[PDB]
C-alpha cells in the first residue's frame, strides 16, 4: 500500500510540475503521497509553487501537503514562490501557515529572495506576515543590503522600517 502511495507520489511530482490539475486531483484521490520527494528533495508543493500553478498549490494544501517542507537546499515552497514572483501562491502559502522567516542552507529567508528579484508586492506581503528585515544570511547580508547591491531604489525605501 505505502508502495502504491510512493508510486503515485512520483506521478504526482510530474503532474504538479506540469500543471495538470485533473491528473493531480485523480492522483490524490487514488492515494498519492502528497509529500512525495524527488531526487532534489522537492515535494509536489515545491514544484507547483516553482512553476506558478495556483490551483494545484491550493489543492495540495487542502489534502495535507506540508507547507514548510524543505528540499535539499533548505528551500520551502514559500522560498520558491518568492523567487519566481508568484504573488497569489505566496498569499495561499501564508494562509496555510508557511513560516515567513524559514531559513535555507545559506541563511536566506523568503524576504532575502523576493528582495533579490525585486518583487515589491511580494516583499510587502512578507513584511505584513512578519518577515525579519534584520535577518542576515550566511554572508552577513540583510534584504536591505541585497537591494543596495542591485541598485533597487524602490526596495531600499520599502525595506526601511
Amino acid at each position: 500500500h505505502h508502495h502504491h502511495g510512493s508510486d503515485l507520489g512520483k506521478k504526482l511530482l510530474e503532474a504538479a510540475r506540469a500543471g495538470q490539475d485533473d491528473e493531480v486531483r485523480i492522483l490524490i484521490a487514488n492515494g498519492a503521497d502528497v509529500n512525495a520527494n524527488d531526487e532534489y528533495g522537492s515535494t509536489p508543493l515545491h514544484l507547483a509553487a516553482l512553476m506558478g500553478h495556483l490551483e494545484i498549490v491550493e489543492v495540495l494544501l487542502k489534502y495535507g501537503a506540508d507547507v514548510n517542507a524543505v528540499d535539499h537546499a533548505g528551500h520551502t515552497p514559500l522560498h520558491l514562490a518568492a523567487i519566481q514572483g508568484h504573488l497569489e501562491i505566496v498569499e495561499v502559502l501564508l494562509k496555510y501557515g508557511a513560516d515567513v522567516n524559514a531559513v535555507d542552507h545559506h541563511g536566506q529567508t523568503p524576504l532575502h529572495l523576493a528582495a533579490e528579484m525585486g518583487h515589491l508586492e511580494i516583499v510587502e506581503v512578507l513584511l505584513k506576515y512578519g518577515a525579519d528585515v534584520n535577518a542576515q544570511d550566511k554572508f552577513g547580508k540583510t534584504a536591505f543590503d541585497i537591494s543596495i547591491d542591485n541598485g533597487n531604489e524602490d526596495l531600499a525605501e520599502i525595506l526601511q522600517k
Binding site: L50, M117, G118, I146
Partner: protein, 129 residues
C-alpha cells in the same frame, strides 16, 4: 568572493555567456544562484567521491583535476583550485566546454531542477547591462 545578482549578470555578460549555445543570460545567472548562491568559493562533496567547485560547481571526476578524486578525467584540463577565484574566467571557460558538446545546461542539476522551464529572464531584470 560572493557576487550580487546584477553584478554577476554583468560579469557573465562580459564573459560572452548571453545566448551562448542558445542559452539566454538569465539561465547562467539562475544556475549560479542554485548551484552556489553566487559564491566563487563554494565546494560540495558529491555521492561518488567527487567534489563540485566554484560558482558553477564544476565536477572533479569529469571536468577539473583536484588530485583527490578516483577516476579523474579532467576534460577541461584545469586544476579545480583555478575555479575558486574571484575572477570567473576559468569557470566560464569550463562551462562553455561542458555546454558545447551534449545536452546543454542539463549538466547542472540545480539548473534542471530550478531554472529549466521557468521565466529565466527574471534573473537579469533590474540590472544595468
Amino acid at each position: 568572493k560572493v557576487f550580487g545578482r546584477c553584478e554577476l549578470a554583468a560579469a557573465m555578460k562580459r564573459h560572452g555567456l548571453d545566448n551562448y549555445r542558445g542559452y539566454s543570460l538569465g539561465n547562467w545567472v539562475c544556475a549560479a544562484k542554485f548551484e552556489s548562491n553566487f559564491n566563487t568559493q563554494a565546494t560540495n562533496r558529491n555521492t561518488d567521491g567527487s567534489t563540485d567547485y566554484g560558482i558553477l560547481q564544476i565536477n572533479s571526476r569529469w571536468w577539473c583535476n583536484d588530485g583527490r578524486t578516483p577516476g579523474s578525467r579532467n576534460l577541461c584540463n584545469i586544476p579545480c583550485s583555478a575555479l575558486l577565484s574571484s575572477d570567473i574566467t576559468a569557470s566560464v571557460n569550463c562551462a562553455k566546454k561542458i555546454v558545447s558538446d551534449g545536452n546543454g545546461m542539463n549538466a547542472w542539476v540545480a539548473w534542471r531542477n530550478r531554472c529549466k522551464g521557468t521565466d529565466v529572464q527574471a534573473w537579469i531584470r533590474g540590472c544595468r547591462l
